[PDB]
Design a binder for this molecule. Structure first.
Ligand SMILES: [Ca+2]
Ligand SMILES: [Ca+2]
Lengths: 317, 312
């Protein structure tokens, strides 16, 4: 009954909540943590991932460091204004005693998937660079992955990096387009659904009074994330993007999915934009969406059930 | 009380309904019809506009021919599959006896707006090429226009040219970006709202039994549009006209709109919702916001279109 998963992540405040939720999930085995840039640098993401393994007493869970820059190259623009200078808010934790594995995130991904064919589900919580590099290295990777659950994109909704683009896709558009076009069993969880799942002061404070294993830390890390949300929007609500993506992987019943070809804009002002062909209309001419195999896009979300699911995992002793 | 308007159009089945509605609107004066490509070629659009003036007994309304291709150049892709080979369905009408004016659509636009400053409202029913050329020719055009009502874009909705783009914006993205960025008082009516306003067989057949001035012709022209299509039709242009004369039936949202001119998502309209303060300056920051149609009172708009078309 045990479900084998690999988490590709940039921790990251909301990533940390999802990683800890995965470690608390009963029928879930975290094969390893794959690190990437985004919320913080690849260096910081690796450190934070090692810290999480130590805190959760999951020292057996290996951490594989990935790409330091996107497919096109160049120093990435990290979201330190939303996640903190180190990517973990104001939470001052000492250096982890454990080390990263020698193999890259790409090599770890390729190896585990080929070892357990049709068994490994990949949860992509950050830019898709490592997954795209893994697809390019092994042609049987696409065939051997059970499913890829992607947190990214904005489908008929405003982006967070730019009005047109969501952060993860904006951080590496080329990689996102390569993954969405790969023909693998992909499930995309965009801002259109994650911005529906709100967390008020009530649930965050309910989490503090509980005897949750990592409750005190998660409330401490979410404190910085709350202050940014109130400054940027003027609302005392927070969207936990990564935990919603985890809920789509382990509890897909709480969501509704729509089939369609997704393409990513890699050029111009709308770089990082995710355009989905709804397939309801037959096009008069062949376009960049014709011929490619469709992927599943999260369309509807049972907001009260997802919030209660996240709360049940976080409050768990 | 009379409202001075210029219609920039590519007639066009739905454009023809809106033009005839404007001619039937009480406190509305159509200063002229500005032609453009899109639903048909610029040549066909000009012919169809002249035919409409003749049918409506509005021979005093001048027709100024505009651009035959977009700002970037090249033969445009016309929607003859949706509007017919001539852009007026299967409605076989003889050549109009009246002719177009000597001045271009750009020169007509610039002249009428400078003559009546802060009085002329421009209804853009097709690609924005003529309006962008008018902005580039006269720097005081943006200041002198009362308002520009634009039919185009797809704001958090699927496009009709591509999944990302609406036809009018896709036909000339450079022009659309130049207009949305001009700083003029712009009102955008996208697919997000036009696909909400449905016209069934019931309303179309209700229109036939009425003693409407151009009812028989409008049902004949909409017959081809119905066959192309669910047994429902979206009358895009008439909704845009309703936003110009009856804005109360709509809700508008302020925001900076940018148009993608490059790549796969060419023609996409991205609106900065302004609800979030950006940490750094981006292509949506150094520009004045425009009004985007957000909500539409669907039953009131349908009843408004019906009252104008059934009018004797
Ligand atoms: Ca993340
Ligand atoms: Ca039109």
């Amino acid at each position: 009954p045990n479900s084998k998963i690999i988490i590709d992540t940039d921790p990251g405040i909301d990533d940390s909540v999802a990683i800890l939720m995965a470690f608390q999930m009963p029928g879930v085995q975290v094969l390893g943590l794959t690190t990437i840039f985004g919320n913080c640098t690849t260096e910081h993401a690796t450190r934070n991932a090692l810290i999480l393994c130590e805190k959760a007493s999951h020292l057996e869970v290996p951490v594989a460091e990935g790409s330091h820059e996107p497919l096109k190259g160049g120093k990435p623009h990290v979201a330190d204004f939303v996640h903190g200078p180190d990517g973990l808010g104001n939470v001052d934790l000492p250096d982890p005693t454990i080390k990263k594995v020698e193999e890259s995130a790409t090599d770890f991904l390729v190896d585990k998937v080929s070892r357990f064919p049709g068994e490994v589900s990949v949860l992509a919580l950050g830019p898709l660079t490592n997954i795209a590099l893994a697809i390019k290295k092994d042609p049987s990777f696409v065939k051997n992955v059970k499913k890829i659950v992607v947190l990214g994109g904005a489908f008929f909704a405003a982006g967070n990096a730019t009005p047109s683009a969501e952060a993860n896709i904006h951080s590496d558009p080329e990689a996102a387009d390569m993954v969405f076009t790969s023909g693998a069993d992909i499930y995309v969880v965009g801002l259109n659904i994650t911005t529906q799942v709100s967390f008020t002061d009530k649930d965050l404070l309910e989490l503090r009074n509980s005897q949750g294993k990592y409750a005190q830390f998660l409330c401490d890390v979410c404190k910085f994330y709350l202050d940014w949300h109130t400054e940027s929007y003027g609302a005392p609500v927070i969207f936990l993007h990564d935990p919603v993506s985890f809920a789509a992987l382990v509890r897909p019943e709480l969501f509704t999915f729509k089939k369609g070809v997704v393409r990513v804009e890699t050029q111009g002002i709308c770089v990082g934009h995710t355009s989905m062909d709804m397939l309801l209309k037959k096009w008069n001419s062949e376009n960049p969406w014709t011929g490619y195999s469709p992927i599943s896009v999260a369309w509807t979300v049972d907001v009260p059930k997802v919030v209660a699911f996240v709360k049940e995992l976080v409050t768990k002793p």
